[PDB]
Amino acid sequence: VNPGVVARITDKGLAYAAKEGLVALQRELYKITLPDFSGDFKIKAVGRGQYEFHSLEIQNCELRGSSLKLLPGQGLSLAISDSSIGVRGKWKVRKSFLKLHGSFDLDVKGVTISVDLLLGMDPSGRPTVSASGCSSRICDLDVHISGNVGWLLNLFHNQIESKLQKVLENKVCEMIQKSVTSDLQPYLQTLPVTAEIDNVLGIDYSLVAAPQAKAQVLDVMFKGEIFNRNHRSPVATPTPTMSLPEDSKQMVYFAISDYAFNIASYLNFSITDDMLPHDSGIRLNTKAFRPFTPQIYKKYPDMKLELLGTVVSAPILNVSPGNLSLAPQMEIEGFVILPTSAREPVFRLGVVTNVFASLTFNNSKVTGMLHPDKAQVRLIESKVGMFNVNLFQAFLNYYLLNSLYPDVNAELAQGFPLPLPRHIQLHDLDFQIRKDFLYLGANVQYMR
């Protein structure tokens, strides 16, 4: 079913991912334990004997260079290279009735690893990863043995190198297999199944599909649907199929289909005399509108008023990448409610409320804050004499700054919660506007 939100991970973001998984993996290779190599020898220079390289331990492991691509259809293909692993151990060579001792160190270079990361989804809507077809190639070997024993080096090269090489690549590939299922899969699953938005509503971030590894991008599609906290009555399920074109500037782009609070921005509304706070000195009654229209109090002395306004356009243009400049243009008509119980037309106003919105990221949520500006009023028509627009403008401002703007400022400050795994921080928000969905551009940083 069509997802509410969609996390599109770009090639750039897959690159970050690999680099960061690379340091986690590197620490895990230290847990690798090599076996012990023992057997007999018959060196033509010193005779036959027994040897043993035991207590092998990973001492150095440097995994640098890597590459995360897309396997269109199944998932990702990882490739780490130009790495190095150092190995340390002890040896004992029994020649004669004597027994020797010493240490050794190997330096492995030109190390290459390749694994496939299979991305899928479990019934519960949680992510799953699985490494398949792992293969590593251990080659450039540097052997150093304690004591300047020459035959020991030649002996290593003739009878242990190849074995150690394969044993090692085999263990490294097993660490990778294990590490993904015991660390990686439990990490992707740190992604919220459900996040609270407000103390009233909530969103469900269950997967509607396993991440879709497209040719150039990775799309992880979430249910993303709003649901009542007390008992989620599914009164919100129309969400269409979205499809934004190719934006590869940043690491991830979120596509957020719908919200609730002023996401709709043909937005009609009504203002009744009993919708303005009591303490707030503004009221919708002829006697109060007397200064605006000195004639209303004659034609309709002491009566209730109606305002039926409506948005007719909401021009949005970017200032900063994360700062919008919208000015909803509306037309309001004043009605005086006469004893005939039927509203009756008085005047019509044109208003343009210039505002600035500036978004940010803060703790997995997208947050914003309003930046109030000039509210412009222009008389459109009037069947009750001239209208002091200048005076009324001051009231339009009082109203907004004391109602409309403080609330919206709160709605934004509460923010929307994004689908992220643990320890992630987003930066450089590029908030571009599109069809039914908001398209949030961001870069990522793993809180190591």
Ligand X SMILES: CC(=O)N[C@@H]1[C@@H](O)[C@H](O)[C@@H](CO)O[C@H]1O
Which among 2, 154, 168, 141 is positioned nearest to 93, based on CA atoms?
154
- 65 is a site residue for ligand PC1 (CB under 6 A): no
> Considering CB distances under 5 to 8 angstroms, the limit depending on partner class, which of ligand PC1, ligand X, none binds residue 419?
ligand PC1
CB-side neighbour CA atoms (13 Å) of 290: 8
Q: Where are the beta strands (DSSP E) in 291-342?
A: 304-313, 316-318, 323-326, 329-337
**436, 240 Cβ separation under 8 angstroms:** yes
Tell whether residue 77 is a contact of ligand PC1 (CB under 6 A): no
Q: Under DSSP, is residue 44 helix (H, G, I), strand (E, B) or coil? A: coil
332 contributes a contact to ligand PC1 by CB under 6 A: no
Please classify residue 230 by burial: count the beta carbons closer than 10 Å to its beta carbon, then call 0-12 exposed, 13-18 middle and 19+ buried: exposed
Q: How far is the CB of 197 from ligand X (least distance, A)?
A: 17
Under the binding rule (CB under 6 A), the answer on residue 371 touching ligand X is: yes
Are 101 and 90 in contact by the 8 Å Cβ rule? The answer is: yes
Instruction: Find where tokens 């780490």 sit.
Output: 80
Instruction: Report in angstroms how near the CB of residue 37 gets to ligand PC1 at its nearest.
Output: 29
Contact yes or no for 419/5 (Cβ under 8 A): yes
Contact call for residue 269 and ligand X (CB under 6 A): no
User: How many other CB atoms sit within 10 Å of the CB of residue 325?
Assistant: 17
Residues of this chain, 292-331, that bind ligand X according to CB under 6 A: 308, 310, 319-320, 323
Q: After which residues is the chain broken (C to N over 2.5 A)?
A: 265
CB of 416 to ligand PC1, least distance (A): 14
Q: Which does 71 bind (CB under 5 to 8 A by kind): ligand PC1, ligand X, none?
A: none
Relative to beta strand 323-326, strand 66-71 is: unpaired
Q: Which class for 172: exposed (0-12), middle (13-18), buried (19 or more C-beta within 10 A)?
A: buried
Phi-psi region of 176 (alpha: psi -120 to 50; beta: other; left: phi over 0): alpha
Which of ligand X, ligand PC1, none lies near 319, with the C-beta cut-off 5 to 8 A by kind? ligand X
Instruction: Report, in Å, the least distance between residue 17 CB and ligand X.
Output: 23
Binders of ligand PC1 among residues 405 to 444 (CB under 6 A) are 419-422, 424, 444
CA angle 416, 417, 419 (to 5 degrees): 135
Contacts of ligand PC1 in 185-214 (CB under 6 A): 187-188, 191, 211
Residue nearest to ligand X (CB): 362
Nearest residue relative to ligand PC1 (C-beta) = 21
Give the one residue of 266, 386, 388, 436 binding ligand X; rule: CB under 6 A.
266
Nearer to ligand X, 130 or 367 (CB): 367
User: 308 is in the binding site of which of ligand PC1, ligand X, none (Cβ under 5 to 8 A by kind)?
Assistant: ligand X
Selected range binding ligand X among 3-11, 133-141, 221-229, 358-366, rule: CB under 6 A? 358-366
Evaluate whether 227 touches 201 at the Cβ level (below 8 Å).
Answer: yes
Determine the Cα angle at 98 with ends 52 and 92, to 5°.
20
Q: Does 24 bind ligand PC1 (CB under 6 A)?
A: yes
Q: Which residues contact ligand X (rule: CB under 6 A)?
A: 266, 268, 308, 310, 319-320, 323, 333, 356, 358, 360, 362, 367, 371
State the residues that interact with ligand PC1 by CB under 6 A.
7, 9, 13, 16-18, 20-21, 24-25, 78, 127, 179-180, 183-184, 187-188, 191, 211, 220, 251-252, 419-422, 424, 444, 446
